[PDB]
Amino acid sequence: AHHHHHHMELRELGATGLRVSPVGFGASPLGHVFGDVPRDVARAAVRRALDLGINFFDTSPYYGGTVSESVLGDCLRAAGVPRDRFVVATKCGRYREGFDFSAARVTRSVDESLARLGLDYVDILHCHDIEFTDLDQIVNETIPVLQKIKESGKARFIGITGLPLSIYTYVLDQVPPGSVDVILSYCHYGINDTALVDLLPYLKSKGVGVISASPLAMGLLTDNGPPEWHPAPKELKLACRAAADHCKKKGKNITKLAMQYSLMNNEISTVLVGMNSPEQVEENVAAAIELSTSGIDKELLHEVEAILEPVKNMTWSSGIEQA
Numbered sequence: 001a002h003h004h005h006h007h008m009e010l011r012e013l014g015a016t017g018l019r020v021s022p023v024g025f026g027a028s029p030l031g032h033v034f035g036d037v038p039r040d041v042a043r044a045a046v047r048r049a050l051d052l053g054i055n056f057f058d059t060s061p062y063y064g065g066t067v068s069e070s071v072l073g074d075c076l077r078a079a080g081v082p083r084d085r086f087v088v089a090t091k092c093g094r095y096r097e098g099f100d101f102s103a104a105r106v107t108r109s110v111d112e113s114l115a116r117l118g119l120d121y122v123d124i125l126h127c128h129d130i131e132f133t134d135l136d137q138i139v140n141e142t143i144p145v146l147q148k149i150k151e152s153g154k155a156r157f158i159g160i161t162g163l164p165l166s167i168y169t170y171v172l173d174q175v176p177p178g179s180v181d182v183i184l185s186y187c188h189y190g191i192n193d194t195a196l197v198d199l200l201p202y203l204k205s206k207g208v209g210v211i212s213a214s215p216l217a218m219g220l221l222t223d224n225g226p227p228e229w230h231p232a233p234k235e236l237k238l239a240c241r242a243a244a245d246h247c248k249k250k251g252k253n254i255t256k257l258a259m260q261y262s263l264m265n266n267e268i269s270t271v272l273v274g275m276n277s278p279e280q281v282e283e284n285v286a287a288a289i290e291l292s293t294s295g296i297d298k299e300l301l302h303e304v305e306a307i308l309e310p311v312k313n314m315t316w317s318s319g320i321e322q323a
């Protein structure tokens with residue numbers, strides 16, 4: 001006899017032609033609740049992800065965890081992965097010293113990112129956290145500039161990211177069709193908040209691919225709970241603590257349940273997870289394969305959904321007023 005080897009099933013990303021693993025390797029916010037790791041651990045996490053079939057890596061030039069553009073670049077170089085077998089996204093506009101979405105900064109940004117990544121092009125270049133600028137700048141200036149960067153061949157596809165779902169309608173209503181290829185949304189496709197679903201037809205109709213992130217809502221859907229800085233309302237924090245406790249008391253793990261839940265909508269091509277160590281990679285890939293072969297625990301899910309119902313889709317402010 002032998003054991004059957006199940007693998008993740010790739011998803012098609014928008015109209016890009018890219019086929020991406022349903023679990024993607026993302027960044028972590030500063031001060032995330034796992035804590036940082038040494039560079040050797042970060043490199044081993046990326047290697048483990050490549051070895052388990054993750055083929056989508058998201059990074060940025062801004063603060064995160066130990067996994068950075070330079071770490072990704074070194075790991076990809078060392079692994080020798082064929083370029084058409086993995087997908088890399090980076091971002092521009094958000095830096096440690098502040099936001100700068102101007103034409104000269106982002107044009108320079110891309111070149112810096114490419115050197116760190118050891119690539120001639122990125123698959124995706126996103127405008128990062130655009131709710132922190134006047135969205136008309138993104139419409140009138142930054143997306144035009146990224147068209148030039150795409151035409152240069154240094155980025156194949158252009159994206160926009162941020163927290164409030166209203167940024168995507170504001171921008172995508174006001175740029176020429178085809179100007180944006182993908183979006184990255186976070187915190188809006190997980191058990192406590194699925195509001196991204198309300199944009200999926202819209203995005204499809206505009207030929208925009210969909211990437212989601214933060215399936216555990218930056219630590220809400222964990223046993224440990226969120227970091228002290230987390231801007232969720234206390235009412236949401238309380239409900240997520242009750243949901244985690246509900247799972248724990250029964251010998252189950254909310255993180256696994258939450259990861260699997262976020263994977264249950266195939267109109268989202270990849271769900272990015274901030275992973276810090278090989279073990280976290282192993283756990284998330286197993287959750288995704290188990291979803292595919294054994295199913296989610298539906299009764300536990302229904303119970304957790306009832307706990308979270310009063311706070312479903314509750315969010316928090318981000319960025320400036322659009323005036």
Ligand SMILES: [Mg+2]
Nearest residue numbers: 134135136323
């Ligand atoms: Mg404005």
